Amino acid sequence: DVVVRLPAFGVALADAHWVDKTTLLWPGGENKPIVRLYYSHSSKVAADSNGEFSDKYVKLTPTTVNQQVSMRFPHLASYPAFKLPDDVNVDELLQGETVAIAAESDGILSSATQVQTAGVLDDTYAAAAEALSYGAQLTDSGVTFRVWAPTAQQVELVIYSADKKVIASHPMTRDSASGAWSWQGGSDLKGAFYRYAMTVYHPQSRKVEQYEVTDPYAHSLSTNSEYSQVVDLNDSALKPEGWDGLTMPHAQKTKADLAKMTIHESHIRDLSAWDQTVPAELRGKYLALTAQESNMVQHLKQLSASGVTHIELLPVFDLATVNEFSDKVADIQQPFSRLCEVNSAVKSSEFAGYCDSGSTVEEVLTQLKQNDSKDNPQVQALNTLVAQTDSYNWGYDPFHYTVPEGSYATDPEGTARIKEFRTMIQAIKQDLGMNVIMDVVYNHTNAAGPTDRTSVLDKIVPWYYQRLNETTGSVESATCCSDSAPEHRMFAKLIADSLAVWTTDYKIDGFRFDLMLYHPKAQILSAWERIKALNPDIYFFGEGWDSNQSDRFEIASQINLKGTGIGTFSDRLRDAVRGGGPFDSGDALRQNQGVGSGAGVLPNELTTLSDDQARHLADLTRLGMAGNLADFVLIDKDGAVKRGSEIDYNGAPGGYAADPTEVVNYVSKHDNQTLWDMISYKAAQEADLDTRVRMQAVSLATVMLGQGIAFDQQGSELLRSKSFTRDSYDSGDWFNRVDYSLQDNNYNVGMPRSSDDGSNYDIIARVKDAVATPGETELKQMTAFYQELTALRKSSPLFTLGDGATVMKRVDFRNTGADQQTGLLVMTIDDGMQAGASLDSRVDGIVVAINAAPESRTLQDFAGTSLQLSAIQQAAGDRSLASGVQVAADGSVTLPAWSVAVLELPQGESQGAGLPVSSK
Ligand SMILES: OC[C@H]1O[C@H](O)[C@H](O)[C@@H](O)[C@@H]1O
Ligand SMILES: [Ca+2]
Ligand SMILES: [Ca+2]
Ligand SMILES: [Ca+2]
Ligand SMILES: [Ca+2]
- Measure the CA–CA gap between 96 and 45, rounded to whole angstroms: 10
Burial status of residue 148 (CB atoms within 10 A of its CB: 0-12, 13-18, 19 or more): buried
Tell me, yes or no, whether 664 and 771 share the same domain: yes
Burial status of residue 240 (CB atoms within 10 A of its CB: 0-12, 13-18, 19 or more): middle
Q: How far is the CA of 422 from the centre of ligand 4 (A)?
A: 39
Q: Is the CB of 439 under 6 A from ligand 1?
A: no
Torsion sign over Cα 636, 642, 644, 649: negative
Question: Pick from 880, 823, 874: which is nearest to 849 by CA?
Answer: 823
- Residue that is last in its domain, among 77, 108, 124: 124
Tell me, yes or no, whether 719 and 814 share the same domain: yes
Burial status of residue 367 (CB atoms within 10 A of its CB: 0-12, 13-18, 19 or more): middle
Backbone angles phi, psi at 766, to 5 degrees: -75, -35
Cβ contact 591:608 at 8 Å: yes
> Total domain count for the chain?
4
In single-letter form, the type of residue at position 45 comes to: V
- Residue that is last in its domain, among 833, 868, 890: 833
- Where are the alpha helices (H) located in 440-505, listed in sequence order? 457-460, 489-504
- Letter string b/e over residues 88-124, b meaning 16 or more CB atoms within 10 A of that residue's CB: bebeebbbbbbbbbbbeeeeebbbbbbbbbbbbbbbb
Instruction: List, in order, residues 6 or more apart from 812 with CB less than 8 Å away.
Output: 827, 828, 830, 915, 917, 918
- Measure the CA–CA gap between 198 and 461, rounded to whole angstroms: 10
- Measure the CA–CA gap between 215 and 400, rounded to whole angstroms: 8
Cβ contact 668:848 at 8 Å: no
Q: Is the CB of 480 under 6 A from ligand 1?
A: yes
Q: How far is the CA of 271 from the centre of ligand 1 (A)?
A: 20
Nearest residue by C-alpha to atom 12 in ligand 1? 480
Tell me, yes or no, whether 666 and 756 share the same domain: yes
HSE, CB side, 13 Å, CA atoms: give it for residue 720.
29
Tell me, yes or no, whether 482 and 599 share the same domain: yes
Tell me, yes or no, whether 279 and 143 share the same domain: no
Q: Where are the beta strands (DSSP E) in 742-892?
A: 811-814, 824-830, 843-851, 857-859, 868-869, 886-887
**Which listed ligand is nearest to 485 at the C-alpha?**
4
Q: Is residue 4 part of a domain?
A: no
- Measure the CA–CA gap between 855 and 389, rounded to whole angstroms: 51
Q: Is residue 667 part of a domain?
A: yes
Question: Pick from 153, 155, 224: which is nearest to 193 by CA?
Answer: 224
**Which listed ligand is nearest to 218 at the C-alpha?**
2
- Measure the CA–CA gap between 705 and 629, rounded to whole angstroms: 16
* CATH number assigned to the domain comprising residue 885: 2.60.40.1180
Q: Is the CB of 671 under 6 A from ligand 1?
A: yes
Name the resolution in angstroms: 1.8
**Which listed ligand is nearest to 796 at the C-alpha?**
5
- Measure the CA–CA gap between 677 and 655, rounded to whole angstroms: 28
Determination method here?
A: X-ray
**Total residue length of the chain:** 920
CA geometry: angle at 721 spanning 790 and 285, to 5°?
Answer: 80
Q: Where are the beta strands (DSSP E) in 656-719?
A: 663-665, 709-713
- Do the bridges between strand 663-665 and strand 709-713 make them parallel or antiparallel, or are there none, so unpaired? parallel
Tell me, yes or no, whether 163 and 110 share the same domain: no
Domain ranges, residue 152: 125-232
CA geometry: angle at 835 spanning 885 and 260, to 5°?
Answer: 65
Point out the residues that are catalytic.
514, 543
Cβ contact 421:316 at 8 Å: yes
Cβ contact 479:443 at 8 Å: yes
Tell me, yes or no, whether 450 and 399 share the same domain: yes
Q: Is the CB of 729 under 6 A from ligand 1?
A: yes
- Measure the CA–CA gap between 18 and 116, rounded to whole angstroms: 6
Q: Is residue 680 part of a domain?
A: yes
Torsion sign over Cα 484, 487, 491, 495: positive
Q: Is residue 2 part of a domain?
A: no
* CATH number assigned to the domain comprising residue 289: 3.20.20.80
Q: What share of the chain is helix, strand, coil (3-state, %, to 5)?
A: 30, 20, 50
Strand, helix or coil for residue 827: strand
Q: How far is the CA of 755 from the centre of ligand 1 (A)?
A: 14
Question: Pick from 38, 137, 48: which is nearest to 93 by CA?
Answer: 38
Instruction: List, in order, residues 6 or more apart from 272 with CB less than 8 Å away.
Output: 278, 282, 283, 284, 285, 288, 291, 294, 296
- Measure the CA–CA gap between 136 and 661, rounded to whole angstroms: 38
- Do the bridges between strand 207-213 and strand 193-202 make them parallel or antiparallel, or are there none, so unpaired? antiparallel
Tell me, yes or no, whether 104 and 222 share the same domain: no
Question: Pick from 883, 895, 890, 884: which is nearest to 867 by CA?
Answer: 890
- Measure the CA–CA gap between 327 and 875, rounded to whole angstroms: 53
- Measure the CA–CA gap between 342 and 79, rounded to whole angstroms: 52
- The set of long-range contacts for 77-82, using a CB threshold of 8 Å and a minimum separation of 24, is 79/17, 79/25, 79/26, 79/27, 80/25, 80/26, 80/27, 80/29, 80/30, 81/23, 81/24, 81/25, 82/23, 82/24, 82/25, 82/26, 82/29, 82/35
Tell me, yes or no, whether 282 and 138 share the same domain: no
- Measure the CA–CA gap between 216 and 193, rounded to whole angstroms: 14
- Residue that is last in its domain, among 232, 264, 279: 232
Tell me, yes or no, whether 216 and 285 share the same domain: no
Q: Is the CB of 399 under 6 A from ligand 1?
A: no
- Measure the CA–CA gap between 183 and 231, rounded to whole angstroms: 16
In single-letter form, the type of residue at position 13 comes to: L
Q: How far is the CA of 476 from the centre of ligand 4 (A)?
A: 8
- Measure the CA–CA gap between 210 and 345, rounded to whole angstroms: 33
